[model samples]
Target chain A: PLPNSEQFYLENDRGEPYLIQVSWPLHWEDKQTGRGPLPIIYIVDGNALFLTATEAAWRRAAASHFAGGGIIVAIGYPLKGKLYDARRRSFDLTPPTACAPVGYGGADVFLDFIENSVRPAVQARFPQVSLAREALYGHAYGGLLALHALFTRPQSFDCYIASSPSIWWNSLCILHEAKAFVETSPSLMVSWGSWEQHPPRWADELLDHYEARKRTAAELRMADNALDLCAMLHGCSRLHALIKTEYEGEDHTSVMSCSVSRGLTMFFEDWPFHQ
Target chain B: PTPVPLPNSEQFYLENDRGEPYLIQVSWPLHWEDKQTGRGPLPIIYIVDGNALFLTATEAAWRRAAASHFAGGGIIVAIGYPLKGKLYDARRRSFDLTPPTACAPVGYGGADVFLDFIENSVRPAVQARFPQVSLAREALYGHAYGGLLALHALFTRPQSFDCYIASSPSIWWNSLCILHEAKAFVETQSPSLMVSWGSWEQHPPRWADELLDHYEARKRTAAELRMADNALDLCAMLHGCSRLHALIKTEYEGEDHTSVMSCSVSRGLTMFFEDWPFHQS
Candidate 1:
């Protein structure tokens, strides 16, 4: 319940309820034109990442960076036993993968829900939405979805942030998807923590299923996939710009803060950053 | 009306021996689950000046602890004056976060009083809340006056917290009492320390070229404050100590005092909590 924040349940075309949280920063709207053309960052996984995204958005907007006033609309599901509502997210946020989480091929529908259902409501809620400056951010599976949206509907969002994207989803299909992509004017940022490929806290004895997780991590190639996708995106002719960052000392799980923080910083400003 | 409730965060009250109440705001990771049988000691950071910085620090720290599988989103406890508002109850903080001295510009309490309150009251209260989690390395983070207090804690009471993060500390205060403490600390044993401030903290600030009349006065003030010089000198002294190890000192560019607080808290937390090559590395 931060300042200028509102949450409610909104249904998509298929009539499934999704928890929507909108965080609008103070003094965002102009007296005359009303928040004329600022970034509206749409985030995935509302339950876990919404609060963090809002805070980061507010902080960055507060700094009065280039084109300051940005809003965040987090797309999540109603709570009822799923961890961060994973039951739906696994399906809604991931694309079709042979080894997908159950019902994981819903990325297209989810993007439709965002572009159609939630996004319009956001535009109506504020009546001060940015047109070409819209952006979407997602992590892991959600990151996969973000890439899906950018490749599938390039005009939907001008900027995309995919942090530690689960490129390993569906047998590395996302990499294959990116190879055939082209966008005349879209900016993308791909980032991951340095330790994404490494084990955390002596995993061998810390918890359960150590062998599977390591093999999964090795197979996931969290850092590698992120780099591979970014490398291909960088080669897109006439593509607005692409920035790939590997934050030192960050692991997959903890990399969220740096991801959004640095990602938004890159998108919304002429910020000085190291490659 | 109650203050705007921060979702996924809890608040409570604790009183000092003098019966003055201090509000404590606590936030856990959104996806928090202790990997029991010990999954790396739950690293908790006790943030000072919670009234102002809690929300900002919450996003940064939780995301940090959530960084890895072993990274327990941990816990954040913000120690603030009971009174509300982000202005940070300056009167209360000026008294609570400063050390006792006859030369005290204003009547104030010693840092030990607040430090004791944290160790005895706040720490115990958090442990009681979730006894399931074992805290191995606790951190103390502060900025500005609170930053000064963090250094005060490190200098006077080194072992109180396993790690210390002081962002833009006001070392010019109380006639450089902390430097004296630093000398005494060279006389003691260890813990990790992080000291940070903005690049413009020294003389000839970024805004210096704009105003001429303001230039002379601002230059003197910056020189006397010596925010950058003091922090660098302090880091150098600590580096020379030979007793303390695992220290990080940084000066961020293009950020002023206000901007640097968040940068320090976010990055400082990262340096100490996530990336440091500590045993839990």
Candidate 2:
């Protein structure tokens, strides 16, 4: 009998473990002509991610472009009946979130896990085309982490895709982080639902102003704001990290769950693509 | 504008015809691959577990076939919710499944209606693109109550599928009313069926043996029946109707409802329909 696909797990550096649920490339032997590498996508809040992504894939199963699409990877807390796991993620994701209220700073560690543990495990177990040709995706808190890696550890991926980065964290702590590290050459794709309004709604305004002025250090309000800090770095080296996908009727929470395929498709297109 | 993969899909909980939300989940492939390469146009393997199986089937297929093993082959479509529910989810499913009943709380017992939905809403959408070789190209897998449905559907609508698999059907429901249907129908139709029941220990008495006897007695030229585990009594009982028949398993001590159900789904997919047209060869 063939192996079951749902069971997947890996341990962190400290031996603390996490769960992974993934959907590999779907193609039958007769149908898979010499297509190139399959794009990789990751959805956080695994259960929710897994459910929504598959549904969309099904509804769009016809159109050839949408057919036999890319790969999907879902990572999330594994505990089945505990609210604590979600609570912990929320606290850790936006950690130091109280006074500073910045989101979980542990994303760097999570990335290391992906680099050393998760990615290797997936490639080893499945049909992999290439690693250098990879994309990073996440939404909401997970989206924040995706952007964090884009600038902080730019070499980690070729495409950076995120939705509603909790950029509002620390009153734009993540935005500042992006400012400092946006010098890399990777393709960046950011999406936000039009309904995705931040608490102050002022952060978007502030970032827009900085982007327009190109400088205005005072607008940053931080030693590190991606809008300004990035300008300060390499004088806007990979400044092309600015493609935005805005949904007219979606809100912050709805946007994360909504963009699974659209974001990934864009990420695939940004890469060298062909028939 | 595309509901394609992105941060997420916002409409998961919106109530549709079923009055309950049409739940869903997804994982995306980074790039599009050609199905002729057997790489993608990823096939979906839908399971009809409860009535909520639609999204779950979508997710399971998405995850299981992510490697695009059957991309050009066919997409799966699982159905969820009870065969009948207060909301129309089961009403939709009942239309697809067979042996419609009048049970309330489960829905309207609309097996024909459920089948119509598949013919209308589900199957065509899949067949429109993914490698749909023929009606017999994909698989029809069900379990327990669903198992009963799968069999009834094939007997009644043979052209809809190439393979029919059922695991531990609640044949006892309606005093095995389907038994009469099975016996009467095969006398006139041709279908492929793979039936598996737990060991005598798994089930009470020799119920499988009795059912198999009835099944085999009416088997037609193109019809085939295979039994597994300690289900031989049923197999022997129905051995006559099958043009070709098989039983390759023994009784198991630890198999329960869940394990048995899971084993049957995998068994049905791999054993009966995995290689698909290749198996036809």
Candidate 3:
């Protein structure tokens, strides 16, 4: 058990199990107004990414005058001492494509698990979550899934945060989906690092991608895809709000830390305060 | 025992040279195997006001290392006064953080001694526990008065730590005394520095009317303590000396004196530990 947090495991209708971790927000019961008092963020890759979101909310809540912070519910696997279960995440986070990869494309089922099982469980524990405040966050492959959720079911969350989204997955298939995305009220924040699209010569030995990474300049371009998608999303007037940020000197791996809390601040801080 | 205990966290008690006690809390990064297998030297950020800010630092580090090969990697060391049932021991930190002044607010001027304790007692204790394969890359961090002491460390002895992060420093203390030390100082090392404050630091706090009444009694204006102004001037003074030196200064919006630590520690850790293509680099 973490400080002011609880952990449990639940299975989808498919009998697949996931470890659910929820860090309750501070002053959760002390709501001054009735309007969606506790904003919530749901993060994917919780086996590896859960604690960071929890911590992000904790630190922000401590300093915020008008904010009661937020409840962070991380959707992760039951694995311990492991940051990620590679095969499981690939299967769960990726979407069904024309040429579906083996053991992949369970995103629809994965989300069904959250909307049906995980969400009801969260609300049962803290009924404030039973109300109308929700956000979705994901990274890399998880980021791709977040896009799928937004395009297919925009009503699931009030906001969506995708950091270093692997938009290059399946030949820019997510961008094609975004081409048709329509929404109202819910907002989105898309972010990536400057170094993601390509690594500098100085980073050859520094970064993990040292097959000497062929610099044909035609490799999987992460930032280009995100910026291009943002370009398309900006033209849609029905969208509530959309924000894009490019962090300096950060790459796909580090941008998870660089972007998560900032994305949260952009979403939760702007929430109307009764003051 | 703490009111909050972080996962993968550890703590121990040690006293300074004068037998004054300090509580050191360590939050190791997300890598379970790196304690032995990782080849490079891990970055360690030593945070002041450990009792209050320790959790903030740990949460920042964990998130930065999220779902990756730990590219955003570092160990967090929170150096705090030992106290029970309180987030901060106000009297102890006042003496521990502020530099000495003639008309002191309280018994002050322990910046040098406290830092010495860090470099000597606190750091050695950490290295003994984890046994970094190489010299652990070091960075120092603090907020408010803690921020003041970090600046004092950078100006007074830049060689001790490789990186320095001062968030919302109380640079107005002792009539801006640290500026005197910084003016004579020269950047001879490869160490980097980052300073940050809220954009609303100059704006009056929520209790402005009540505090303004008190300030009128003393014949001083609310403009006396210009938070962002002093921060900007401090960066300019440091930059006046060296353009090639690595230094970062940020002003965060929608945050104030009480609420900017989340923005400061989370983002500052990435700037310090994670490789940023900063201009000076």
Best by lDDT: 3
What are the per-residue Cα lDDT tens digits for candidate 3 across B1-281?
A: 11222457788899998998888888766556445544557777899988666765676566554523346477788898865433466777788888766677657887888888999899889888776445557889989998998888887788898878899999888889888777777543456788888766676444323466664543343257678889888788778466226878887664566556766776777666665334463
TM-score to native of every candidate shown: 0.76, 0.44, 0.80
Q: How displaced is residue B144 in candidate 1, in Å?
A: 4.4
lDDT of 1 by residue, A91-122 (tens): 89887766666666988888888888888887
- lDDT string for model 3 (A158-208, tens) is 788888888888777786678777443567778887776665544225554
Question: How do the residues B127-214 of candidate 1 rate in per-residue lDDT, one tens digit apiece?
Answer: 8776677886788999888888988898887778888899899888878878888888886636778888877667444331246777
DockQ measured for candidate 1 = 0.17
User: After best superposition, candidate 2 residue B179: deviation in angstroms?
Assistant: 45
**lDDT accuracy of residue A27 in candidate 3:** 36
In candidate 1, list every pair of residues with a backbone clash. Answer: A30-A35, A253-B67, A254-B67
Error (Å) of candidate 1 at residue B100 is 6.1
- RMSD to true structure for each model, in Å: 5.9, 23.1, 5.6
Mark the 10 consecutive residues where model 2 chain A has the least summed lDDT. Answer: A195-204
lDDT score for residue A140 of model 1: 84
